[PDB]
Ligand binder design. Structure first.
Ligand SMILES: C[S@@+](CC[C@H](N)C(=O)[O-])C[C@H]1O[C@@H](n2cnc3c(N)ncnc32)[C@H](O)[C@@H]1O
Ligand SMILES: C[S@@+](CC[C@H](N)C(=O)[O-])C[C@H]1O[C@@H](n2cnc3c(N)ncnc32)[C@H](O)[C@@H]1O
Ligand SMILES: C[C@@H]1NC(=O)N[C@@H]1CCCCCC(=O)O
Ligand SMILES: C[C@@H]1NC(=O)N[C@@H]1CCCCCC(=O)O
Ligand code: SF4
Ligand code: SF4
Ligand code: NA
Lengths: 332, 326
């Protein structure tokens, strides 16, 4: 005479606990990231409910420009732009400011409300390039009216002050993977170098955007470790890339993830970080295909449009239509 | 928990119970915020009573235009100026070429579809029988057909040649049928369904969302399919045709469509429920939601007077949802 309960009850219980002020434990998150295919839609649904409980129904749209491309001394095993790997990538110096402003203007027409200057290379060690970056970041913000981001690699405290002064509101630095996996993906810089960078940005009063890449041979457990590590670092802006394997790099042959594995991972990040702005970045179109729309009703509330650094995306108008079709709104 | 009743009703159904009309009306009004819980529960009901396969079908427009029926939605009606291609029953070799293409595209079954009230000329009908035979026996697809109003004697002949699905949409709820057609009636459809069933053929019957029905009428439509023991249900979404009285009907919101699909699954837990016409146009990048939100079949390869996307994309999507084919 007791009704039979479904396999997905724990998902409901935990979601309720979080929406009532509790927190998921590591063991719980590990269980949830192993959710079945059959129960995945309940997990995604409950992530969407957590998202709604702690945030509005807006989707934050960003876009980037590869303002300086290729020729990087770092050996990050996934990156097209490393010198240790022949990938046939475009190489060029810092774009001229009018060219950058054009891209800024296109990103705004496309529906981005914030825009990142991204450069290859460890850091920006020449103080003249840095100065050019500051100059054009200012023009973007004051003349185009976009919030400004940047991804400049390793960052000193003095640089972060300057970024803060010119009006940067997100400083991007990805942890890439779980601390326990970072040695297996890069050796020319360390995890510690990422901590320094992130700390320096935070101490200058800049909200840090930090995430990483699913599909680097991390275990599911390590994806959970990565989320809690972001929690530790007080990160509330999280871009989740999915590896786009680059011919010539060592991760060329990395096995593709199953779309539902990716979507489950997104949902579990939401459970672990209920108040964060969590977004897709690289690899969305190619690795989620016709399931991309699941992300924004499965725990994510941001999207990078207009393509990436050395890899493309779909038309941003299709992305704006998808947001509308999901009955979500566009931020700011 | 604003979505608690969704969970309770779903669990009741999976423990052997039935949704009430009143409850179905409430569920079809689920908020946007609660829509994913509804789709999830419909996915659980689909899994509980069926399996994890997606049935892939395709069609050919074998005879086009010049229909004396005045269905307000239909491009092939003669009462409406619509610019539709008109042609009599296609030649065997063309039809077989279309069937080969469908099979290559991943369809397990294939429908000869005709404009018209019916086929009255017994010779034209035998031509239909002849080619149905060659499709099944030579190309090796299961065979469906959609020939309009059907007599018992016609149904026996289709059974004999090996037709495994006879298609005849009810289109809408009985209470809305007069508002879409007056050259034939709702009861005309009821005789056709009975005739096909009594000959031993599984009937495939659904209809069209977006014909100005109320949400309540969509529920009525599902309950009628329930009463009729229909277990193969194609859910079309109106593609408004220029020149028809419904050319200016408003598009439905994707989530409204998906909520409707989910509610049909709650009412018909055991049924093979598929998308048909207007899927790509009206669901766009939310099409994938249907197969993890209550549906378990898909029509690929485009329609009668309207196209579809690449079937390979459709097959990839099935695979990406961790579903199988058969
Ligand atoms: C951070 S930007 C370059 C700026 C600077 N060099 C740095 O390392 O911060 C390059 C970022 O794109 C992502 N990325 C690079 N190659 C990728 C690939 N093949 N697939 C997916 N994401 C990738 C990584 O997460 C990486 O943090
Ligand atoms: C049923 S077949 C034609 C065979 C036969 N004349 C009959 O009415 O049964 C045509 C089917 O396509 C669907 N259909 C027609 N025009 C449509 C449109 N504009 N949008 C969506 N579905 C449509 C209807 O459900 C209709 O039953
Ligand atoms: C820098 C942006 N922020 C982020 O987390 N990834 C974006 C870049 C992704 C690059 C994808 C691979 C390529 O285009 O080379
Ligand atoms: C006959 C098939 N089965 C069904 O229920 N609908 C299909 C036809 C869809 C037609 C869409 C509009 C057109 O192409 O004219
Ligand atoms: S991710 Fe950054 S640091 Fe690593 S190789 Fe690419 S450009 Fe260099
Ligand atoms: S009976 Fe069939 S072909 Fe004729 S108008 Fe109606 S749907 Fe169109
Ligand atoms: Na389903």
């Amino acid at each position: 005479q007791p009704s039979q309960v479904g396999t997905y009850e724990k998902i409901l219980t935990i979601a309720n606990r979080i929406m009532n002020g509790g927190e998921i434990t590591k063991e719980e998150a590990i269980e949830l990231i192993h959710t079945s295919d059959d129960d995945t839609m309940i997990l995604l649904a409950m992530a969407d409910k957590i998202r709604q409980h702690f945030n509005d129904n807006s989707v934050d749209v960003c876009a980037i420009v590869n303002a300086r491309s290729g020729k990087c001394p770092e050996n990050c095993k996934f990156c097209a732009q490393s010198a240790h790997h022949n990938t046939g990538v475009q190489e060029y110096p810092f774009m001229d400011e009018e060219s950058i402003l054009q891209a800024a203007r296109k990103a705004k027409e496309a529906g981005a409300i914030r825009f990142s200057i991204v450069t290859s290379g460890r850091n920006t060690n020449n103080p003249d390039e840095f100065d050019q970056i500051i100059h054009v970041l200012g023009r973007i913000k004051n003349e185009i009216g976009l919030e400004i981001c940047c991804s400049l690699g390793l960052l000193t405290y003095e640089q972060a002050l300057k970024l803060k002064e010119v009006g940067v509101t997100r400083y991007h630095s990805n942890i890439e993977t779980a601390p326990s996996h970072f040695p297996d993906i890069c050796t020319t810089h360390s995890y510690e170098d990422k901590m320094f960078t992130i700390d320096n940005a935070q101490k200058a009063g800049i909200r840090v955007c930090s995430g990483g890449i699913l599909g680097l041979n991390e275990t599911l457990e390590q994806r959970v470790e990565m989320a809690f590590e972001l929690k530790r670092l007080h990160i509330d802006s999280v871009p989740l890339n999915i590896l786009n394997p680059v011919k010539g790099t060592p991760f060329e042959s990395n096995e593709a993830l199953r779309p539902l594995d990716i979507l489950r991972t997104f949902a579990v990040f939401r459970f672990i970080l209920p108040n964060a702005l969590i977004r897709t970045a690289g690899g969305r179109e190619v690795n989620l295909r016709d399931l991309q729309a699941y992300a924004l009703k499965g725990g994510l509330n941001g999207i990078m449009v207009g393509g990436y650094l050395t890899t493309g995306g779909r038309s941003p108008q299709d992305d704006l239509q998808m947001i509308q079709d999901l009955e979500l709104t566009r931020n700011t």
